[PDB]
Design a protein around this ligand. Structure first.
Ligand code: SF4
Ligand code: SF4
Ligand code: SF4
Ligand code: SF4
Ligand code: FES
Ligand SMILES: [K+]
Ligand SMILES: [Zn+2]
Lengths: 230, 48, 360, 95, 113, 126, 96, 114, 208, 176
């Protein structure tokens, strides 16, 4: 076998060559916080929440894109890893609008859950927040671009899985916006899946709008019959 | 009002005899007080 | 005319409280403890709050610690007035019941001016207290407690030296020191039998080690010594109240960990991190680390303990409530042996029994 | 802005009314159906749109801590006004 | 000094505590002579009983004997000596120095599940 | 020895006090709960959940509330492994079905594949 | 406080105390029902610098219970704690 | 598969205890009918006792039948002393509730319950 | 970690660990686990067959003197074969300490009653029966203490629903309070509040 | 740190024993109790004249529930369902849908006033101060179904009691 030995918090584990740090931590049973990573999408590595500390290495590395080396000791609960997570949460929540009661992602928001778990508990942002103009992409997806965190799962899904290539990032710096840049609707046969992959309440389901809340719903596992895929 | 009395008896109300077409000469009710006087009567504030 | 066997049948107030706690979060389970002992409302909140704070590995701020002890001693005055005047009401001395209930009404104003409800405050919460004292509240507490030593003396004049009251209580329900420990007795039942034990002196909590008070110790274990111990505890509760008013420190009222205690409404509507925490704490609640603990405080009835089990989620796995009145009622058959039918109603009176906590 | 059903019943602001064949109307016989005559949508329709001279605007509903959480509204679209998500107030850029 | 009362209801005051405590401690040692030596219970309670017997033997007084035995009054010390004697007899009856009778299941004491 | 041998299967249905209608006509589903697709967390898929089928919920004539006549509607039981849930279902006499746990297959991730020289896995934008 | 001096003297004689000094009925000595607005203080974690949450998180410092013995010489006998101290009689009012 | 017994080492002692419990209930039933002023006859009460005994007659584990005999003894002592009211005695006779459908067609007509 | 974090008690931790080793060394026939929590609470998990000697030792040894029985509890964990965990809380006034003793039983195995050690348990464990069905052998008077007289089933078991299977109402035809199957006007709304993200890394269990 | 209640040895001299004999032959303490009651007769009773006089209350008082509005006519509630998630008695039922102008508003807001324990968690979990517990407490009904408030009843209560609820919130909100 060609497996290499790495260490997560001092515990040894064999991994295939080319395995990332995040995949090794998932193998040992630890879920590194992530925003832009998705196991069915290409690696972007821009949200910088998966930053973890390798022992005897004076720089945190993005675990979603860093391949493991032989003898690496990954410290997922170290002090500077938590410091990096808190700083990235502060930067992510600096410009987010106070929209949680009027947002459909409330109660199942990834940003809320990781802010509660790995983030801090108060804000130092004394300035004014930005505001982004809303877009229209059809009567299926309700769009509130002010809540977007520029994770670029939109473009990766529309370019690699849907095969549409109609979404993109226009602008530069803090004015970078995700959209189609023109009055165009994103109508594919797999469009609504973007509502599943948005970690924030930027893209929500328009028929489901303002109807229920995730904590009060009962889940029944069933099989679709709209086609023969099952 | 009568500030010489002790706390509880220092403010009181004499109800009207007719309120909303109902003869309340004997049938006085505790809910006949409007809210703006309900705040003063229940000692939630000093200012009438 | 004698009594040879006593069989108290309970379950007439079994609401099944501790099963309903398992289906609710830690904040939602707080008002359940108000309705267990409905004359010691803020004392049962403190026992539950100290158990959750022990599992959360957090501590309340120093100002909130002094408010809990100050309102704990006001609660002790509430229970002892009820436990003595209604004990005389069942015996037949109905007149001091009405005198002391006017003072009981004035302390109900202190509860409602600080929490909003007269009886079930839901004020003491895990992490501190919900709201700060309003301005001018401690001036009224000083005015009330200044004249309260006269009110105990009027009740003491009617009962302590009265020969009819002594004849109903001199040699009724005598329990030994060795049998009081084995029967699970606590509080005045141990204290009236000459056993030197008090949870506020031996296993102290928040600021009870910084105040000075005395522990009345009985000598014969009868109904009269337990009556005198309960009256003396009202005098000592005034002594702690005067110390709490003069030693109240400035500061905050909740633990500054915003992931446990909710933030202020001013910063909830301004900063994003506070709105997320306000959203999650009032819907899911704070997650308590796994473990089990048994935290007991000196309730006015006796030792009120809560055995709390957490499984790492936001809801308790098991919340056992130990009440002082449950073990005291078990010894009713032993204490009433060889006594008359009318002597039994004094024994159920000399044990301050509230059936909300006996049946839970 | 209430309306009256042909059966003689008042329609609420949620649009609820009982049908003519519905038996549940027997719960209103001898008593009255309680409706609110102040419609929130009608009352917020009369509020004038405020003109401001900035790209973004901040709304908290007035009163500071007595209002809603503070939100920021973008006013780049000249076709339509920028409505607050909480209070329903709308703003317009004057340029 | 002829103490008037012990302050505990139902616990009478003993006229002579020294001879009573010596008799109880000697009876405890005689009972513990039957337990096998390798049992840790015999060693531990023999050590503490020998210590208490030495204190009660090298002390003529009563009040400072109580204050240095650290057991409250001398009457509850006598009561605890009798309780230890009864416990030693029951310990002889039970024989708990033997190895463990049964292993628990694999996840019997695992929390959380 | 004070020990007796009982080789019959465990059957405590006569002691639980549940009526037979909710014993023989219920189907107990034993499963690992699926991950919510709106979140990437996997902490809710660590334990086995056992639940029952859903019976009728109707409308209250007064307020339109959800009224039910099924007592076991809110019963959800947590088990560490599948065999504990199976043993608990067989002990209580509930007819049950069990579905196997679905784990994600290990993927192969490479950041350099976004910048390939001749493969179709080039990204049109970053 | 509206009683005559004769009735006050009769009450003081029959009660045994001076009841006019300690009246249970409240009067103008109590606080006003309306109060000036307060300014509440902030806690110790209301800071802009050196206020990282990882250095003050109480919940994350809770460890699992340490196992002392598990089934997978001449040491002194011990006690759960040193024996309790004898309570001292009160110097204020020992009732003796 | 070696377990600690409750009272009976095998099925014979358990059946003996069942016999004693049935004897005691059969002796008790007329006193229950007369004392509580029930509207049922002695035959109805004894048939009810036999109905419960035959309903709970498919077990084969000595501990289970031991616990069942224990619970039946507790109910017997609750009936011997006047602790149950008329309502608690008449709980066994379900008179107020409508008789549930048994065949397929009536259950199909009334609702979705299998 | 000064203002908002609960301070540790290391001397109490050391003393409780030493006493736990002492107890586990004196009685190796019955004890199975000895643990001390992070907030200095001593738990001694023992075999059920030693529920009578061990408690008696803690009631009578001169170095323990746990004369007070504070509480008696049963905990239902359905994932174990021995689903009932029985907990004794003991208080020692002489040394000012508290201890916890835990045993395990299933539905059918009886328990030796601790009435002969502590009299208060004569009610306490009886309540356990009325809530759990755990039979206590050699009890003086074992019966129900909290539920109704005609109540079938044990409510505090985790397979017992919140609302029961019957409910009471007055019927004018039979002039009596009668029991009927439960039909709630509002269903109890079950809330799934558990977040899918791990909160405490220190309590993380190893995978399979 | 402890005192000995009822551990007094009475004097055995002739004066004290004659005082005790005179006490049990002439009923001194019974006369003391009579004098206490007679002195308590001539005090002014603390009885207020209800309903013409009311007991004192604080602006934190939790009474009847009400739904507030903005000072423009728009209702404050935006259907966030925090109050029904925090309600310990599950007295609150909320159903919501977007209305004609696209705002997030409720279509059903029921509070079961026979389930509610009047704990004030809903008014402290509301991010917009929509639901409040007003100062009204004299609202006892004659029928059970009258205590089942819907959205219209709560809106009417808010419009009825706004002039007092706003003043109470203004006087209290600095402590929150
Ligand atoms: S996306 Fe998440 S953080 Fe943003 S408003 Fe919605 S719930 Fe709040
Ligand atoms: S809208 Fe959502 S999925 Fe799309 S880039 Fe923004 S955060 Fe990512
Ligand atoms: S006061 Fe409490 S119980 Fe009543 S509706 Fe509000 S949250 Fe529910
Ligand atoms: S908490 Fe307030 S805004 Fe949210 S649903 Fe309830 S009343 Fe409406
Ligand atoms: S998950 Fe790795 S940088 Fe976003
Ligand atoms: K989404
Ligand atoms: Zn606004």
């Amino acid at each position: 076998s060609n497996l290499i030995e790495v260490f997560v918090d001092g515990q040894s584990v064999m991994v295939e060559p080319g395995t990332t740090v995040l995949q090794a931590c998932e193998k040992v049973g630890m879920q590194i916080p992530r925003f832009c990573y998705h196991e069915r999408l290409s690696v972007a590595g821009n949200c910088r929440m998966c930053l973890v500390e390798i022992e005897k290495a004076p720089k945190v590395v993005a675990a979603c894109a860093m391949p493991v080396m032989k003898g690496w000791n990954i410290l997922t609960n170290s002090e500077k890893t938590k410091k990096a997570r808190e700083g990235v949460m502060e930067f992510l929540l600096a410009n987010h609008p106070l929209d949680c009661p009027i947002c459909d992602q409330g109660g199942e928001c990834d940003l809320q859950d990781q802010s509660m778990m790995f983030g801090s508990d108060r804000s130092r942002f004394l300035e004014g927040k930005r505001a982004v103009e809303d877009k229209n992409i059809g009567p299926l997806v309700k769009t509130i671009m002010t809540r977007c965190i520029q994770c670029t799962r939109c473009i990766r899904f529309a370019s690699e899985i849907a095969g549409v290539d109609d979404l993109g990032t226009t602008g530069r710096g803090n004015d970078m916006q995700v959209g189609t840049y023109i009055e165009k609707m994103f109508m594919s046969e797999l469009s609504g899946n973007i509502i599943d992959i948005c970690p924030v309440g930027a893209l929500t389901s328009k028929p489901y709008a303002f109807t229920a809340r995730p904590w009060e719903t009962r889940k029944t596992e069933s099989i679709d019959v709209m086609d023969a895929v099952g | 009002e009568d500030n010489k009395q002790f706390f509880g008896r220092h403010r009181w109300v004499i109800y009207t005899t007719e309120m909303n077409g109902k003869n309340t000469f004997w049938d006085v009710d505790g809910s006949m007080v409007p809210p703006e006087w309900h705040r003063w009567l229940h000692c939630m504030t000093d200012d009438p | 005319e004698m009594v040879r066997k006593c069989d108290p049948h309970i379950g007439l107030l079994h609401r099944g409280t501790e099963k309903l706690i398992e289906y609710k979060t830690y904040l939602q389970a707080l008002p359940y403890f108000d309705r267990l002992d409905y004359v010691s409302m803020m004392c049962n909140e403190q026992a539950y709050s100290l158990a959750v704070e022990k599992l959360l590995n957090i501590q309340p701020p120093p100002r909130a610690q002094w408010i809990r002890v100050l309102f704990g001693e006001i609660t002790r005055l509430l229970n002892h007035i009820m436990a003595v005047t209604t004990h005389a009401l069942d015996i037949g001395a109905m007149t001091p019941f009405f005198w002391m209930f006017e003072e009981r009404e004035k302390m109900f104003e202190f509860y409602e001016r600080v929490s909003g409800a007269r009886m079930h405050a839901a004020y003491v919460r895990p992490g501190g207290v919900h709201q700060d004292l309003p301005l001018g509240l401690m001036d009224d507490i000083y005015e009330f407690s200044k004249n309260f030593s006269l009110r105990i003396d009027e009740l003491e004049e009617m009962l302590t030296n009265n020969r009819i009251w002594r004849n109903r209580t001199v040699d009724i329900g005598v329990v030994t020191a060795e049998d009081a420990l084995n029967y699970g007795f606590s509080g005045v039942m141990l204290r009236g039998s000459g056993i030197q034990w008090d949870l506020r002196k031996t296993q102290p909590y928040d600021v009870y080690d910084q105040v000075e008070f005395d522990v009345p110790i009985g000598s014969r274990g009868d109904c009269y010594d337990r009556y005198l111990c309960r009256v003396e505890e009202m005098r000592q509760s005034i002594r702690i109240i005067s110390q709490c008013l003069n030693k109240m420190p400035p500061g905050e009222i909740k633990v500054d960990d915003a992931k446990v205690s909710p933030p202020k409404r001013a910063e909830m509507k301004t900063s994003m991190e506070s709105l997320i925490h306000h959203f999650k704490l009032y819907t899911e609640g704070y997650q308590v680390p796994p473990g089990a603990t048994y935290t007991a405080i000196e309730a006015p009835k006796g030792e009120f303990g809560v055995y709390l089990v957490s499984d790492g989620s936001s809801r308790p796995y098991r919340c056992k409530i130990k009440a002082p009145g449950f073990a005291h009622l078990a010894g009713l058959d032993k204490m009433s042996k060889g006594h008359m039918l009318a002597d039994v109603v004094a024994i159920i009176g000399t044990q301050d029994i509230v059936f909300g906590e006996v049946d839970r | 802005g209430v309306r009256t059903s042909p059966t003689g019943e008042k329609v609420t602001h949620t649009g609820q009314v009982y049908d003519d064949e519905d038996y549940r109307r027997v719960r209103f016989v001898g008593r009255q159906k309680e409706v609110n005559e102040n419609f929130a949508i009608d009352l917020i329709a009369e509020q004038p749109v405020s003109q401001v001279g900035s790209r973004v605007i901040s709304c908290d509903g007035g009163g500071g801590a007595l209002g809603h959480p503070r939100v920021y509204i973008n006013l780049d679209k000249e076709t339509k006004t920028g409505t607050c998500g909480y209070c329903g107030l709308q703003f317009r850029q004057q340029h | 000094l002829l103490k008037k009362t012990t302050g505990l209801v139902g616990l009478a005051v003993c006229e002579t505590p020294h001879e009573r405590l010596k008799i109880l401690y000697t009876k405890i040692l005689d009972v513990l002579g039957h337990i096998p030596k390798n049992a840790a219970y015999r060693k531990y309670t023999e050590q503490i009983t020998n210590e208490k017997l030495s204190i009660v033997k090298a002390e003529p007084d009563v009040k400072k004997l109580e204050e240095q035995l650290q057991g409250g009054q001398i009457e509850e010390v006598i009561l605890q000596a009798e309780n230890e004697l009864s416990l030693a007899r029951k310990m002889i009856q039970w024989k708990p120095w033997e190895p463990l009778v049964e292993e628990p299941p694999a996840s019997q004491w695992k929390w959380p599940i | 020895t004070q020990l007796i041998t009982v080789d019959e299967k465990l059957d405590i249905t006569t002691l639980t006090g549940v009526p037979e209608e909710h014993i023989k006509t219920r189907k107990a589903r034993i499963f690992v709960p699926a991950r919510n697709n709106m979140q990437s967390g996997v902490n809710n898929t660590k334990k086995w959940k056992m639940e029952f089928d859903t019976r009728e919920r109707w409308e209250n004539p007064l307020m339109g509330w959800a009224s039910t006549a099924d007592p076991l509607s809110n019963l959800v039981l947590t088990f560490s492994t599948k065999e504990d849930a199976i043993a608990f279902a067989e002990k209580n006499g509930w007819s049950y079905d069990v579905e196997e746990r679905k784990v994600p297959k290990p993927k192969s991730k490479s950041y350099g594949a976004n910048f390939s020289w001749n493969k179709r896995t080039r990204v049109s934008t970053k | 406080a509206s009683a005559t001096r004769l009735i006050q003297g009769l009450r003081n004689w029959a009660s045994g105390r001076d009841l006019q000094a300690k009246l249970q009925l409240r009067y103008q000595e109590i606080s006003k029902r309306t109060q000036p607005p307060p300014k509440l203080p902030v806690g110790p974690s209301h800071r802009l610098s050196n206020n990282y949450y990882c250095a003050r998180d109480g919940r994350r410092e809770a460890m699992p219970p340490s196992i002392v013995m598990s089934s997978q010489s001449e040491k002194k006998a011990v006690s759960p704690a040193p024996p309790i101290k004898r309570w001292e009689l009160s110097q204020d009012e020992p009732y003796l | 598969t070696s377990v600690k017994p409750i009272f009976s080492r095998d099925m014979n002692e358990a059946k003996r205890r069942v016999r004693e419990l049935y004897r005691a209930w059969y002796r008790e039933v007329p006193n229950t009918v007369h004392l509580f002023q029930l509207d049922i006859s002695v035959k109805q009460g004894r048939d009810k006792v036999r109905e419960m005994f035959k309903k709970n007659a498919h077990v084969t584990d000595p501990r289970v039948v031991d616990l069942l005999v224990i619970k039946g003894k507790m109910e017997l002592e609750e009936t011997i002393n006047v602790w149950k009211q008329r309502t608690h005695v008449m709980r066994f006779f379900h008179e107020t509730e409508a008789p549930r459908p048994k065949d397929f067609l009536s259950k199909f007509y009334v609702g979705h319950d299998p | 970690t000064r203002p908002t974090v609960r301070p540790r008690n290391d001397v109490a931790h050391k003393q409780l660990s030493a006493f736990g080793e002492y107890v586990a060394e004196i009685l190796p026939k019955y004890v199975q686990q000895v643990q001390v929590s992070c907030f200095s609470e001593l738990e001694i998990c023992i075999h059920p067959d030693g529920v009578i000697p061990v408690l008696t030792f803690l009631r009578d040894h001169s170095n323990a003197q746990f004369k007070s029985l504070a509480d008696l509890t049963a905990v239902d964990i359905p994932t174990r074969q021995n689903r009932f965990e029985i907990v004794y809380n003991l208080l020692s006034l002489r040394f000012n300490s508290r201890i916890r003793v835990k045993t395990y039983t299933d539905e059918l195995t009886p328990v030796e009653s601790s009435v002969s050690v502590y009299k208060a348990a004569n009610w306490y464990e009886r309540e356990i029966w009325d809530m759990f069905g755990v039979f206590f052998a050699n009890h003086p008077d074992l019966r129900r203490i909290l539920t109704d007289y005609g109540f079938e089933g044990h409510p505090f078991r985790k397979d017992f629903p919140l609302s029961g299977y019957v409910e009471l109402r007055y019927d004018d035809e039979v002039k009596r309070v009668v029991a009927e199957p439960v039909e709630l006007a509002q269903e109890f709304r079950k809330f799934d509040l558990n977040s899918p993200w791990e909160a405490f890394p220190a309590y993380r269990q190893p995978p399979e | 740190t402890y005192k000995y209640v009822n551990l007094r040895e009475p004097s055995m001299d002739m004066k004290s024993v004659t005082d005790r004999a005179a006490q049990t032959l002439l009923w001194t303490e019974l006369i003391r109790g009579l004098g206490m009651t007679l002195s308590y007769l001539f005090r002014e009773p603390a009885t207020i004249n209800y309903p013409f006089e009311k007991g004192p209350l604080s602006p934190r008082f939790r009474g009847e529930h009400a739904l507030r509005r903005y000072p423009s006519g728009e209702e404050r509630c935006i259907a966030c369902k925090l109050c029904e998630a925090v309600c310990p008695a599950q007295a609150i039922t909320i159903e919501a849908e977007p209305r004609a102008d696209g705002s997030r508003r409720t279509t059903r807001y029921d509070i079961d006033m026979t389930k509610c324990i009047y704990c004030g968690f809903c008014q402290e979990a509301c991010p917009v101060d929509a639901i409040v517990e007003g100062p009204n407490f004299e609202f006892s009904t004659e029928t059970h179904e009258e205590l089942l408030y819907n959205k219209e009843k709560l809106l009417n209560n808010g419009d009825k009691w706004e002039a007092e609820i706003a003043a109470n919130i203004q006087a209290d909100y600095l402590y929150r």
